[PDB]
Amino acid sequence: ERQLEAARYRSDGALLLGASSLSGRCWAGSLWLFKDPCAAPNEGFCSAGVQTEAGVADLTWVGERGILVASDSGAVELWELDENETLIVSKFCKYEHDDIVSTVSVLSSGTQAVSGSKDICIKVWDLAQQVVLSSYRAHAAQVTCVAASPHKDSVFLSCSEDNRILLWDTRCPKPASQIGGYLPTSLAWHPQQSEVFVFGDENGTVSLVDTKSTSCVLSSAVHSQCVTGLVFSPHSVPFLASLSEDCSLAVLDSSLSELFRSQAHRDFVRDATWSPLNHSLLTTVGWDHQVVHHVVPT
């Protein structure tokens, strides 16, 4: 597994890595836990490691010991670190989607998750009951990104290759609503203004949108290629880490101005996780098998 797909820091600072082999003889995936982020991604120096039967398109921490994974086989899978946190064993593997599950997001309560897929469907999951509560054929093309509301279970965002950014509220009879330019590729809810979000497009542009007066507030030509990710810093006045297929990491302020720029990666930058311990430390992983630990000038 050379292609690093995801990097997520948990509360204490343990770094979770998601990886897959996108070439060569075998096309499988792997999950890893590094209680020492500096030893990443060396397999001989990890705390926990598992080999999944298919690739890892997306993942999310579920609490502190649970790992929800979007698989290439069309399954949504839940893994669980044991008592000692030395093994990552499987709890459920449910094949409900009819194609690659490309995106996954844990809803506010940590009791439900929203999955998105190349099969055009968005599913809501009850993690404990291990079943699908709702399936929405809302888009007209591959679901690119699904991002749950930081505080409401019935609220979440979706974007797709059909050029639609949908704002969902499952309390309405028609849950989804279209939000007001190229195809939407990434979504990130603001952690402070919980009625504001950012989205990245396939042309490199990053936009700031307001949920109430939905008509797009600010936009910046950040990248020369597709925006793969937008991750907010743990600061009270947070910074936005934007990552791209242009193999570069950017760090923006609140006016979307570039403060930091890292061209350390030699391949696609897939994820970015800000450390809970040092808020100026941001970790990015890429298809070049590099785990790059950055020191953002906050």
């Binding site: 060569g24 298919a54 290439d72 309405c172 609503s177 391949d267 298809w287």
Partner: protein
């Protein structure tokens, strides 16, 4: 009976996956040739210098498994019609890279999706791959009956799904395909993989695909209902569509995930097999013509050419045709000779164009059951068939039959006929030149003589068939007009086509013919009302004949003689296909032309648009006199 494939978008280990698919009973596997998520960069650094092998090795499977079991697929991220220039350029290099790797592997088919209106650059890139090297492989365009945008759930508050009917708009994915294959110059290597959704569209949407080259039908697991004992089944409306696809011999593809885990994945395939074994039983015509489906042949010219022995044998194997002829002569003998003249009045029967002798034996069988006296004359110009007749005469018939080795138009008959019996008709009734032959024989028929058949009429019907139009297109030859193939009729068992309007009569001939002037030349205008949106490619031709009073023969589908499988319909192509919208009228013009040497047809379309006059002066096709 059912050739099936498994569509996967996840193949962790190809030998392992192929072993499981084969175990499940599938004949083939559609899979990605590169990892579907492995986006590659061809222009910008540092992503363009990505090391390592770009995909798995060709050594993983044997050459025969690559040639027979694997159908490649284009990576979902490849978007040659993207509105972003960079994505478009990267997607063009990636598309050629995937198609070339597929050609390197010797794959028998490669899938490419039509999932939007604009596919111009996808078509240009595929046309370019076709015009490079000498690979020769099939291309399968994945195209749904219903676009995703038109089958979505009505759950977007500020974008409602329109519940009003839009006739043309419901056929949009047909236009997707039509434009794509028009841009690709009707390549015979480009075909349709029709994707079948959960809720079938209106009949007119399903019928847009009649005549289209459908090579595959994609059945997702999510469309299957669950039966009494929990096994996957399909709706009755879906089942009928399955039966149509079985007739075209399509390859069924199962896509999606296993949603019937309690019954395993081969259950979906086993249900398909059940519909295949228990399909509505076919007719004897379907049993007979098996092998001749849309195979173009030249219409026989038994006047100009001497038919071969085995050609006579195939046309003689028609019990219905000869029993109708026997019944026609039987009835005529009774109507001519009353019981008080049962011995005194001998009837002079002249079989004109006797062949190897099936009509002479029908004339004998009709005289035994009618208990009438007959004097037979078997006239035949083919000296090869006359050998058969003269051996029959010497060994069985005797003095009763006089075999004449001559053309009916030259023969100076010693006696006059009470009845003339002939089989000088073709699939378009007068295309074998029966009027000219029987006209030349009228001088020796009694002033009260009966011709059997007494009348014949040809029928035309406008048809749509991109498969047939491509078949005619392939009949181009050296040393002749490069478009002469479209200016001549073909005899073909029409299979994958759509009849756009009901057959209307074209040309009729009555025998004997009184009217002083004769003139076997004709001119006919026909107006066909079309109730569908379609593409006109030619006209199907048929015939009806009155042997004697209520005894008749027909190949006009609606009145077809039960059991008569000999004559196939004829097809008059047109050089350029014509777009026709619902409610429009197709107006065709047919002329039957002739000089002292040859007879021919000429034809033009005059509405909704004009075509050129086809076969002017018989420049590409004539029937020898």
């Amino acid at each position: 009976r059912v050739s099936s494939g498994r569509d996967l978008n996840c193949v962790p280990e190809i030998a392992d996956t192929l072993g499981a698919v084969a175990k499940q009973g599938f004949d083939f596997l559609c899979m990605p040739v590169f990892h579907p998520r492995f986006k590659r960069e061809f222009i910008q650094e540092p992503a363009k210098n990505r090391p390592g092998p770009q995909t798995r090795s060709d050594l993983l499977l044997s050459g025969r498994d690559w040639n027979t079991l694997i159908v490649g697929k284009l990576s979902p991220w490849i978007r040659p019609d993207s509105k972003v220039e960079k994505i478009r350029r990267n997607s063009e290099a990636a598309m050629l890279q995937e198609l070339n790797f597929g050609a390197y592997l010797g794959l028998p088919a490669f899938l490419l999706p039509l999932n939007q209106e604009d596919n111009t650059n996808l078509a240009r890139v595929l046309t370019n791959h076709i015009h490079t090297g000498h690979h020769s492989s099939m291309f399968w365009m994945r195209v749904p009956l219903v676009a995703p945008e038109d089958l979505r759930d009505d759950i977007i508050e500020n974008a409602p799904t329109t519940h009003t009917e839009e006739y043309s708009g419901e056929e949009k994915t047909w236009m997707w395909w039509h434009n794509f294959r028009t841009l690709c110059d009707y390549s015979k290597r480009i075909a349709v993989a029709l994707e079948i959704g959960a809720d079938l569209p209106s009949n007119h949407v399903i019928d847009r695909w009649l005549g289209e080259p459908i090579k595959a039908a994609i059945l997702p697991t999510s469309i299957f209902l669950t039966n009494k004992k929990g096994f996957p089944v399909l709706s009755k409306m879906h089942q009928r569509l399955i039966f149509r696809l079985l007739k075209l011999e399509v390859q069924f593809i199962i896509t999606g995930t296993n949603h019937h885990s309690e019954k395993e994945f081969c259950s979906y395939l086993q249900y398909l097999e059940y519909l295949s074994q228990n399909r509505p039983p076919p007719n004897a015509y379907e049993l007979f013509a098996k092998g001749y489906e849309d195979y173009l042949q030249s219409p026989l010219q038994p006047l100009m050419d001497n038919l071969e022995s085995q050609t006579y044998e195939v046309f003689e194997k028609d019990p219905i045709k000869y029993s109708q002829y026997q019944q026609a002569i039987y009835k005529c003998l009774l109507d001519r000779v009353p019981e008080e003249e049962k011995d005194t009045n001998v009837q002079v029967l002249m079989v004109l164009g006797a062949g190897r002798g099936p009509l002479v034996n029908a004339s004998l069988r009709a005289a035994k059951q009618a208990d009438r006296r007959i004097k037979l004359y078997a006239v035949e110009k083919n000296p090869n068939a006359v050998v058969t007749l003269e051996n029959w005469q010497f060994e069985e018939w005797g003095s009763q039959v006089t075999v004449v080795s001559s053309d009916t138009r030259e023969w100076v008959a010693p006696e006059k006929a009470d009845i003339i019996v002939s089989e000088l008709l073709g699939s378009f009734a007068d295309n074998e030149l029966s009027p000219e032959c029987l006209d030349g024989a009228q001088h020796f028929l009694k002033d009260d003589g009966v011709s059997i058949p007494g009348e014949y009429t040809s029928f035309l019907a406008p048809i749509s068939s991109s498969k047939l139009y491509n078949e005619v297109r392939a009949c181009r030859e050296k040393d002749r007009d490069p478009e002469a193939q479209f200016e001549m009729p073909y005899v073909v068992r029409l299979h994958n086509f759509h009849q756009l309007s009901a057959p209307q009569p074209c040309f009729t001939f009555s025998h004997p013919n009184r009217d002083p002037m004769i003139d076997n030349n004709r001119y006919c205008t026909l107006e066909f009302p079309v109730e569908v949106n379609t593409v006109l490619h030619g006209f199907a031709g048929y015939f009806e004949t009155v042997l004697y009073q209520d005894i008749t023969l027909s190949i006009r589908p609606e009145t077809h003689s039960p059991g008569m499988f000999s004559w196939f319909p004829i097809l008059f192509p047109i050089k350029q296909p014509i777009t026709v919208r619902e409610g429009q009228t197709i107006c065709v013009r047919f002329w039957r032309c002739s000089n002292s040497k040859k007879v021919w047809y000429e034809w033009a379309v005059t509405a909704p648009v004009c075509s050129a006059i086809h076969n002017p002066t018989g420049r590409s096709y004539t029937i020898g006199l």
